[PDB]
Symmetry: D2
Subunit: 95 residues, 4 copies
């Protein structure tokens, strides 16, 4: 295809960095998928098959955003869980 999807690549890279920054690793299935698709997109970029490159980069961006909100949901439940245990200990002291 054509032209080079350089702005899509930039968007995909941004989503990958956002997911890694919140704590997502290769152990998060969606981040492993995102990194694999982003690598395949670069392989299509070198081949100058830009329609294929754009479609793998779009898919990689989505999987990276799914990994990010997956990790943040677990992190939010864990903090709220620790707040709950804290508040049970406070009531036990005051009761």
């Amino acid at each position: 295809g054509d032209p080079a999807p350089l702005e899509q690549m930039r968007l995909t890279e941004q989503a990958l960095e956002q997911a890694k920054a919140v704590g997502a690793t290769d152990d998060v299935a969606e981040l492993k998928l995102a990194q694999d698709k982003y690598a395949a997109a670069q392989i299509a970029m070198t081949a100058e098959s830009y329609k294929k490159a754009r479609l793998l980069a779009e898919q990689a961006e989505l999987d990276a955003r799914l990994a990010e909100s997956k990790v943040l949901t677990q992190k939010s439940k864990d903090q709220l869980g620790e707040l709950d245990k804290s508040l049970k200990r406070l009531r036990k002291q005051l009761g």
Copy 2:
């Protein structure tokens, strides 16, 4: 005679508050550390009723500092999740 187990319970709550991220900058943790220092002053003086009550007050303020910091951390994580889902909707609504 000495309220040794309460003193230990007060130390446990002080460590729990510091472990979730509370510092001397959290007003309730500074109060807890001051009331615990005063409890140790009373311990050395062998004024064990005064020591027990100050250790109890210090334990409460340490638990209040812990829940104060955990509420802010819970709001921040939920805030980051909200920004994340706004970016997801923007991507998926690119054609809308």
Copy 3:
């Protein structure tokens, strides 16, 4: 004792209304305690034993605030739990 703890009663009533407003009922142990101690505070008020009435009303206020944050913690965990199930269904659709 003396004087009438009218401002304390007012703070106790305010805490009771705040706890009931977030969904706390007689089934939340701390709200049942708060309502019982408040009733006992009013019996002491009529008896003009204002030291006893203040101490009961203070205890009732605390238990009402503990019931309020107990219910709000459970409501916050339930909403975050529903958000988690929703995002699992979203990932299932997109995967």
Copy 4:
């Protein structure tokens, strides 16, 4: 042939979004309802590839509306918990 199971899955998603509090005022729910109406127009026309695709897009927008509303409801409850604990600390710090 006819995407009958997809149409039911799209209806289920729309009912779930409305059940958590989303209305026509949720932009993603308004989109989902518009795309579902267009999917029914294609169903009656017996253009089942068009019907399936619009129904799948409507399902996605309904799931996006649902998690959008649940994020705001989670932030509001956590916000109410924060105000509640500020009042508790104020009461217990009356002597501080």
